[PDB]
Amino acid sequence: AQTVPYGIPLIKADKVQAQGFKGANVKVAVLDTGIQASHPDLNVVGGASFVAGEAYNTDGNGHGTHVAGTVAALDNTTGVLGVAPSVSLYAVKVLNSSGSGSYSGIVSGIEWATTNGMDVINMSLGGASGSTAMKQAVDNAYARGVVVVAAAGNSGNSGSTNTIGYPAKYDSVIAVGAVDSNSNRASFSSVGAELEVMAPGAGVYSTYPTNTYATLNGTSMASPHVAGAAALILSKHPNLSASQVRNRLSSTATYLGSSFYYGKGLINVEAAAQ
Ligand SMILES: [Ca+2]
Ligand SMILES: [Ca+2]
Known part of the structure; x- marks a missing residue:
């Protein structure tokens, strides 16, 4: 019932997960089209929106949700599995529905992320x-x-x-x-x-x-x-x-x-996390 994308095993994130390191307590911001917060295979903890008329917890494009999923799809019995399933995930919407954004929007998301203590952007x-x-x-x-x-x-x-x-x-x-x-x-x-x-x-x-x-x-x-x-x-x-x-x-x-x-x-990643 849970799918393991060929990608996970290829970078050896699977070997690292097995030792007990899954990214717990690490804060990752995803600067994208937003994230469909309600998807059962994701745990979005907060974020901000720098795009007029759209809040950060909806994705009318899909690009953002997809990216969020590779970083952190939940380790459970459904959907897929992320590289670092236990991370604390923030969705910072810098791109619109059609997938493009303004430099000031981006710069705002980048600075938001610095001010809020994100570890990874x-x-x-x-x-x-x-x-x-x-x-x-x-x-x-x-x-x-x-x-x-x-x-x-x-x-x-x-x-x-x-x-x-x-x-x-x-x-x-x-x-x-x-x-x-x-x-x-x-x-x-x-x-x-x-x-x-x-x-x-x-x-x-x-x-x-x-x-x-x-x-x-x-x-x-x-x-x-x-x-x-x-x-x-x-x-x-x-x-x-x-x-x-x-x-x-x-x-x-x-x-x-x-x-x-x-x-x-x-x-x-196994070699890198030695
Ligand atoms: Ca899953
Ligand atoms: Ca570079």
Whole structure:
């Protein structure tokens, strides 16, 4: 009755869960389209909304619920299972129904998250340009000790061109690319010098608005696997600082090829949480 997405076992979050670390007491903010708070396979603890006319606990798109599900779908006897099922999950709505947002909305969600003591911030969104405010916001958060993860882009590769977007491209943020069930790079995955790590993003099944489950493709599906891995590491080593968790993700990743296409490689959380 409970499904275990191929993604969980691939990054070895399952081996870590078995030792008893599931992310309990770790606070994760999901900056997205909101989350369908009423889904039986999710436990949303609070949040804020920076989008006019929509509250933070509804998702009229589905993208946000899906991401939330990869980080934390409940460990129970139904639906799916998240990377860090026991985390404290906040939904910060920065994107609208159609899936897009304004830089000031985003900057507001990023600062909300710093002021409210989030340990991990997930951003499965990106644009061609950043801003000085966006840059300030991510530098300070990370300087204040939060772990910031973003999706690199579903821009693919084209020549020697860098197709990573903002805020992934900022060096205070972990840019995440996507792989398939065979650990092969998905065709859509952005490339460039700022690519840091790879995670599952092709054919990812997760929670979906109106109490169901669905399969989606993207770096948006990949990023959450890393936010969640960050949270596992912290439930195991509370003592760690942000750049210590980060450096653990990249140092112990599985080598898959050139860094321009794969960063340091596929994440392995068992190795990282050593
Ligand atoms: Ca479940
Ligand atoms: Ca970066």
